[PDB]
């Protein structure tokens, strides 16, 4: 129950036809290109941490 996938159920932030939250099929490998983005989130958090470490 990620609230960030729940708010679009309501029309306060969602759009029509968005409500059916289902994955494409039962089984499924992860794509490598989306796995690249996890490293970008980690080095972002590292740089943000080191920025606050100056303060």
């Amino acid at each position: 129950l990620e609230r960030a996938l729940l708010e679009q159920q309501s029309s306060a932030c969602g759009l029509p036809g968005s409500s059916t939250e289902t994955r494409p099929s039962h089984p499924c490998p992860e794509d490598p290109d989306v796995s690249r983005l996890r490293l970008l989130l980690v080095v972002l958090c590292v740089l943000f941490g080191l920025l606050c470490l100056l303060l």
């Binding site: 029309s11 306060a12 759009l15 029509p16 968005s18 490998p29 989306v34 989130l41 958090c45 606050c52």
Partner: protein
């Protein structure tokens, strides 16, 4: 792999006319998010004002600002949701129009292969699933991204020490999801194997049932089903236990960092560097940012999975048509005669054997021709070759001393029109269905054509004359009335080289007599294909063919 990325670039290019709507929606989304997260900040300011001596002048001002920002956020959220829903529909209307305008230029062989129900499905279905891509997914991605940036900005504004202390778990919490997923997938496939094994056992027990009841015992399969379902439940239990253990580790880490954050905040409060309202606003942000920062990777996973459903529409949009090169010659005058030499061809759907070969033909102004031969002996193929609807595989079909494909499509269709084997009329009024493909016309010409085709009795008896509706797919008429309407629709274009496909054999002989009297009333040539000897007895000339060859 790269097929997904090129389809994404196609979907982005397909949206280019909508840039103003997508820019306005982005701008209202950024404004709505900035105006929503400000409420917790001003709510901290209110709680700071209510502690100690109450001042009306600050309290009333802070409540007024809270109203004004909540009003501005709501208005901007409404204008965003309108803009996204409008562009989503505009791209849906355009991509249907481009898809239909691309399909109408294909060869006959594509429609002989591809089923009508398949084209109905992809035109009606996948254009909607394709247009629900950019509007939904750009919205959720931009909302999550700007919410993460705004929340961490406000945390850095309120207290850098507490933000650093909160930012510590970001990596291990991300990595735990990867390690959970990469141990969950194999268990999910083994579940799929175990349920497939149970489905196989129940299917196999159904097929031989008679044998089971007659020779065996029914209950003997029940213990086999128990044995399959025991393994199924044991595997479901192991999957869900691993699911729950990950969810426990996430929370307990989350609640531990939240407690440590609160301890450091209270210690700052003791030192007096932070106010109560500041601590409330910071901890409200702390309960919220962690969902968005986690989900951003899942929605970017769904980004790269959604695009593929669209591939079938693109595969029909850019398929090269197998039709010949466009025509350029305009006769500007009567065709005179038409001829064929060594004509050979076969259907592109079964090209392993010829349907006609070696055929030579000649047609002259003011005369008639009669095709003699067995039922289905290539007569329809010879008519289709004469109308240039399919390209010849051997010989030449040159008319008026020029190549059959050299004349412009409009002029060829207007001069060489031929009556079909079975009447067909598209849905609409008779005053439109009797002149389909005419660039312009007058009701006097259609009324004269209906009289000339002996259809005037049916046309004058109608509920609105020529303006009466012919029903869906021409179903609201008699079969003889349909043949009369088809004969009028052929004569209304005034063709110079017409053809007949034995339709007057089941119809009234008065229709054949009217066609012979009116179409042959000058230089116009006509050729007919029929099995009945009565047509060959009335014909001025005849031609015999059998087994795909002339005789």
């Amino acid at each position: 792999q790269v097929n997904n990325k090129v389809l994404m670039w196609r979907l982005l290019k397909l949206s280019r006319p909508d840039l103003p709507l997508l820019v306005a929606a982005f701008f209202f989304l950024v404004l709505a998010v900035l105006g929503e997260t400000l409420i917790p900040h001003y709510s901290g300011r209110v709680i700071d004002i209510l502690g100690g001596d109450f001042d009306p002048h600050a309290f009333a001002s802070a409540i007024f600002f809270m109203c004004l920002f909540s009003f501005g956020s709501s208005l901007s959220a409404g204008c965003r949701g309108g803009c996204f829903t409008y562009t989503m529909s505009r791209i849906n209307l355009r991509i249907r129009e481009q898809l239909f305008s691309s399909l109408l230029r294909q060869d006959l062989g594509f429609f002989q292969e591809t089923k009508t129900g398949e084209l109905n499905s992809r035109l009606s279905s996948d254009t909607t699933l394709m247009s629900n891509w950019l509007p939904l997914n750009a919205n959720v991605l931009l909302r999550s991204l700007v919410k993460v940036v705004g929340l961490y900005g406000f945390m850095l504004s309120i207290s850098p020490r507490l933000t650093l202390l909160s930012l510590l778990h970001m990596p291990f919490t991300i990595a735990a999801e990867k390690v959970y997923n990469t141990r969950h997938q194999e268990v999910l496939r083994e579940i799929q194997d175990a349920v497939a094994r149970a489905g196989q056992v129940v299917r196999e027990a159904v097929g031989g049932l008679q044998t089971v009841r007659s020779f065996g015992a029914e209950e003997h399969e029940v213990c086999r089903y128990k044995e399959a379902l025991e393994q199924c439940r044991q595997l479901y239990w192991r999957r869900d236990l691993e699911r729950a253990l990950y969810l426990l580790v996430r929370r307990v880490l989350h609640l531990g960092v939240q407690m440590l954050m609160l301890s450091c905040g209270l210690q700052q409060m003791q030192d007096g560097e932070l106010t109560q309202g500041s601590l409330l606003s910071f901890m409200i942000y702390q309960e919220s940012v962690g969902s968005y920062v986690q989900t951003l990777v899942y929605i970017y996973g769904d980004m790269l999975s959604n695009v593929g459903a669209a591939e079938k529409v693109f595969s029909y949009m850019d398929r090269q048509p197998n039709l010949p090169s466009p025509g350029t010659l305009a006769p500007t005058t009567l065709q005179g005669v038409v001829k064929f030499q060594d004509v050979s061809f076969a259907y592109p759907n079964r090209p392993d054997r010829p349907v006609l070969k070696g055929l030579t033909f000649t047609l002259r102004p003011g005369e008639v021709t009669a095709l003699v031969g067995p039922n289905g002996s290539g007569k329809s193929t010879v008519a289709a070759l004469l109308q240039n609807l399919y390209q010849p595989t051997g010989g030449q079909v040159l008319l008026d001393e020029k190549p059959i494909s050299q004349y412009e499509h409009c002029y060829l269709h207007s001069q060489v029109v031929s009556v079909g084997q079975e009447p067909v009329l598209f849905s609409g009024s008779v005053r439109n269905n009797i002149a389909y493909g005419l660039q312009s016309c007058e009701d006097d010409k259609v009324m004269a054509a209906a009289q000339a085709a002996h259809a005037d009795d049916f046309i004058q008896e109608m509920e609105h004359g020529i303006y009466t509706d012919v029903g869906e797919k021409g179903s609201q008429l008699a079969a003889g009335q349909k043949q009369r309407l088809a004969i009028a629709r052929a004569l209304v274009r005034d063709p110079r080289v017409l053809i007949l496909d034995e339709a007057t054999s089941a119809l009234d002989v008065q229709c054949e007599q009217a066609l012979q009297d009116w179409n042959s009333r000058g230089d116009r040539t006509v050729l007919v294909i029929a099995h009945r000897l009565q047509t060959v007895q009335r014909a001025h000339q005849i031609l015999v063919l059998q087994e795909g060859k002339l005789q």
